[PDB]
Write a protein of this length. Structure first.
Lengths: 121, 121, 121, 121, 121, 121, 121, 121, 121, 121, 121, 121, 121, 121, 121, 121
């Protein structure tokens, strides 16, 4: 569930969705694992320093003669994550790809969040 | 890891791969979650009543300016599962599909494993 | 009491007042349970991203021949909750209803907190 | 739930309903907290020395864009309480009021349950 | 407090009041310890098989120069006990005495509760 | 029993006797709870800074048809308390009252124990 | 002692007295173990649905040269049991026998407690 | 059961049989509680310094309409006790009585076990 | 020390200084206990929503013949507290008083932090 | 509270008042922390070897719009301490000062309590 | 009590009586502590390898004005000890002395219990 | 040992010596158990409110052929007790008796310790 | 690692790097321990109120004949810390020195974070 | 430290100082262990029944090349003990010796504390 | 501190100093982490098979307006380590370097500690 | 006792003797606390790297009228310590002083244990 976790950055929501966050100097990359979710069932929103991923996977349909004798796959349908990013992003230049059940989001940092170098004497 | 689990049927192997087993009257359906795995990197073998799934997902490559500040995604590359099925299957008529990181295997039962009905008086 | 609770959003105060928070795309709805509280005894304030609900319920008055032989109802009079919302709201367009001891607050989001959609390629 | 509680008087039933019992010399007052319940959805019955309160509150309906990010309010719909009173009441003269989610029941005692004073010499 | 205690006979109420119950063949004697309570501050009621004793003792008044440096005496004012007797009593013939802070109540049994002897052969 | 208790002042003895000690500027008041004790059965002695209270209450006599089915009242007969007071008293001017099982003793302080005020500049 | 025990039927009292209760269709049989008790020292009373057994056994008398070097036999003298029966009995038709230290009581049920059969279709 | 107990004297056997042992100067008295045992069902044996008591009580017979709804009475049938006495007895002069389910055995001491007095100077 | 405490508002620092925070509609009052601290030894700073109180009390000086045989007074010299307030304050209109070792700070709220009322229909 | 503490010298009373005791060769100094207490509300008494400090601090008054959102300051009003000193003092030469909420009492020793030096050979 | 203790030799009885046993080559000496026991109240018997000491000390009598404020002395009246000796004694040649509450018994060993020396080669 | 014990009165010392203290209206009686102690080996001293009893009992001497196979008797030689009495005694009128190892001391109270009666109105 | 620590200021990152933060009136000083890190391998960035220190120390290289028989030095290569400062800094005027493996960063506060003094009346 | 210890006699103070107390018939001897303390640094005072020992030992001085690699010696400098003696002493006739770090004090008893002998009849 | 640790080689001392030991065939390399220590404040000594490193780092000096709000850096000044090496070294050919707070010592082994190879057949 | 303790240096022996060890560059100083020990009763030996201190203090002699009512001083007579020093000493140049029960030993280091400095480049 990951109902609440904070290491300077916040992740909340319900359901199974592993998430990796990659911080470059000029942008932030977010990788989300969404297996079994169609591309048209993903709502991707962002403003400021927060990003919302919403998805719905169809449940495992079976015939009446068929029955599930073993299952490790979670049965929840509606899953979502709200991520408070460490930097303010420019959401109008963001892009996303979805291949093999993996969502990759590129978020460019705002100019107020790009750090400037300090020279050491 | 799921190193060992037995409910009359055995699953062994290393890595993250949730698996659902669906038993019909004439066939067995196996659903495996493989997000981020290419279709050409999956080795699928079966004989008798055992089925082997082998897969390798590429690790998350990063540039030198980029760094992973948060990650829930497992980092193992080579994953596999060996499943001892409850029935003997005909592997020459088996089929498989791969959509959105989900592998679906249809295994037709052998004629020696199809159960016959008993009438109640 | 709910003296302190944080799931990315903060709730503080004293006394019994269950609260549900519903987040839409354009607004935030807050539902508060205030049974036995008159409509004129509720102070409702909001600015920025924080909302304060103050209420006072009259104590259970009894005649001198009467006595309380059993009571599960809490006896505190002054109750309040301070809620730090996840989004900045427009408090000049907020509305509230009070029916059957249930307070329902509609808070429209500010334009800096309405998230914009990202297209997936 | 208050599945069972006995202090000479019994309370059973399912769901959240705080109850205070006030005993006078000639009557018994029962106060029940029913927030969010309409007046027409309350069934109130009494005979002998037992009183039954039944209620159903409507579930919190949401639009498809809306979602519940926080909730302390219990989600059960059908709630009821059965109260065994300490005295036999006259149910044909009982009255009830419902204001701000609070139900107040006045139960007049039967003449066989009104206690008579003993003079001290 | 003795809020609830049952050994076939029930005692409930609030405050400090030791009670002895003496059962004869034709009557029931109840002894209550009420030190510091005036005779006019005792309400004694009975019907059927239940007896109610209500009392209020005045608090220990002190001058402003005086202070309580040690106290084992309880500070509650209103005390009461409700006793469910093992037999139905005739409350119209009951009597009570109060000497040296001790209340003694004589309750004659009803004819339906006086037990009849069984002869052994 | 209160076998031993010390808060700068000592109480010893056997049996049930709650005691409150009240210290004024010029005197010490001692309140003892003795319900069921006759006035003629109390021996009250004092010298220096110690006071002795001795009492005997008669046991609860019953007829042979009567029996005690419940009793919270203690059954000890001889009770006493020895109290080491915080100040030296004048025992020749002491007085005592006994009403409703409550003994009130007024002990005037000796002139060597009356404290003198210190002025603050 | 069996001070309190309830399985729909109550047993209270002091001392050693094992009791078996046998319920027929028309009567209730009570078996009590009273070894060492004379027949004339047993008081047996019943009314309604409660039965009282009272007994006194003589203490084990010894000469002054004699001494008790071992004893498992309880030393209490006055023993009694109060039994709340599951049915209302007719105490005017009750009978009792006492053989070998065993008391057997036959209590005929009242007509209001004799159950009637329900036919199954 | 008292399967084994030793305080210089031994008691073994199976079942419920309380036993008191009384030692005089010239004899030993043994009191055994055997309620519900007929006089003809008691086997009493003794030799040297050991005594054996054997008894069988009939089980509680019930009609087919009757059933046991409560029972504290033990259900074992064959009971016995073997007692190693502290002194050698003369078993040819022993006597026994059985009244009200109580067995009383008088065992005269042998001349080798009668202790002789020592004079103090 | 109160090294860290958070109820939506933060208190940090070292040493003994009890602090009460009072929130009005237009201002925030902070009460600090500083016994033994001179008025000239208090540094009081505030900006935004944080307030810093710094103080130094002189240590308890003793002559060489004198010694401290008992002491509950803490011995630390430099004490400070940093308080993150719930509202943005106007530090240019703040005032402070110091009487009897008690510091009282009045902080007027900024106009962006004064909450506006929501009308209920 | 410091209800009881003994290190050869006794401190009793109720409320928060840290106390340091300084023993010189000719006098005893007592330092008490009384923040928020007015100078006119302190009663200071001493005789023999005991000293009594009594104080009352006014409660923290608030306007109806104001509320206490955080408080570490204790809310008790009447505080006092009784101190049994290690030496007999001359109370007619005692003096006291009160600055910044700190009370300082100088108690000169009696001539019977001033220790005399022993020469070492 | 010393209810049971075995180091190859047995001591039983009730009450406080310390005993030392001294074994010589030809006799056994038994020392018993009997303070407060008269010389005429001691019954001393022996046969074979067992010795019985019986004593009764008078209880501590007090006048009605006197009371026992402290007591370590045991209050039991009848005391006795049965000692199973390691050797068979000749009770017809035994002697005893009683001085200062100490009983000293000389028991000559029988000829069947005097051990014979074994020569070592 | 009784190294330290305080119930308002103090007992210290080393060794086994049970002591009873009896307080009358005019005197104090002390009973000490000293078995095996000669009359000439007791040192008895008293002043003020403290009493010292010193005694030495001879050790249990044995021949070289003799040995102690069992011993409950304590082996310490020098025993003493110091008793701080509750009242000041007149040691010049004290008397003592020593019979059967029991020392009885009569200590008359000083006139400053004899308590005077207080009349109750 | 210091994975997460919050005292109003946040420290996150991986590896061994002790950090001290010193707050003046006009600036913030950050001291970081980086032993074994070259000056050219330190990336120092800051914006707003957050500061990032990145470093890589070369691993301890050994010849093939050499081996590490003991090591307390951590073996990680890439270390970093992200520090959320309590005040907004001016990163364009920041300076840094690196001496003896110690990094000292001087961060001037922004004018919006410099606190203003409050005068006490 | 020996902060508090009471065996009828009190020892208080700070630091390491073992003390033996020897009570004669006419005097009290006090032995104190003061190793490393000069004779001129000991303040010895006594009055009534209390004795004060004050001492200061110089700390272990080391050269800058020297360092302490092991130390069991306590490092406190100022040590003192206050002893409440069991008897009133005459401080004008007291003497003291100091050899090898051992202080021996001879305190002659006052005439009011010298006990008088009681004759036994 | 590493007060004592032994794995065939000993490390003792006080303070924070991580140490790695590298053993070659002909020499021993010791790496010590000393950040913030000047080169002139390091005393480096060796003889036989033991090496001593002594260092003093200056404490973190602050101006009076500055204060340390967070610190993980240890505050001890004098640090040292004594290392018992596994081999005897030649201290006259030893060398040391100090770069970036890291001390590297090269100790050539003595000829008695250089191991000789054993050929395997 | 300090039976065994090792921090690279060993201390063994029996009895109370605190010891401090001081290591210079050229010598070792040993400080031993021996209060109450005469100068002629100390045996001081050393060879190689081990030092032995042996001492005997005379026991505390008392007159027959005197007794020890309190004692913290240990009663052992023969005390010794064996110390394995960290360096080889020259025992022919050692010296020792004994003042106020403190033994101070100066042990010059051998030339094989004096460490030589290593220069840092």
């Amino acid at each position: 569930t990951m109902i609440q976790s904070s290491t300077g950055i916040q992740i909340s929501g319900k359901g199974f969705m592993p998430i990796s966050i990659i911080e470059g100097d000029q942008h932030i990359k977010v990788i989300a694992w969404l297996p079994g979710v169609n591309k048209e069932d993903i709502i991707l929103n962002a403003v400021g320093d927060t990003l919302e991923i919403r998805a719905k996977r169809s449940p495992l349909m079976i015939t009446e003669s068929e029955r599930i004798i073993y299952s490790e796959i979670p049965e929840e349908e509606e899953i979502y994550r709200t991520i408070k990013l460490p930097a303010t992003v420019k959401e109008e230049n963001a892009s996303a790809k979805f291949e093999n059940g993996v969502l990759s989001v590129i978020l460019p940092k705002a100019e107020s969040s790009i750090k400037k170098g300090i020279n050491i004497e």
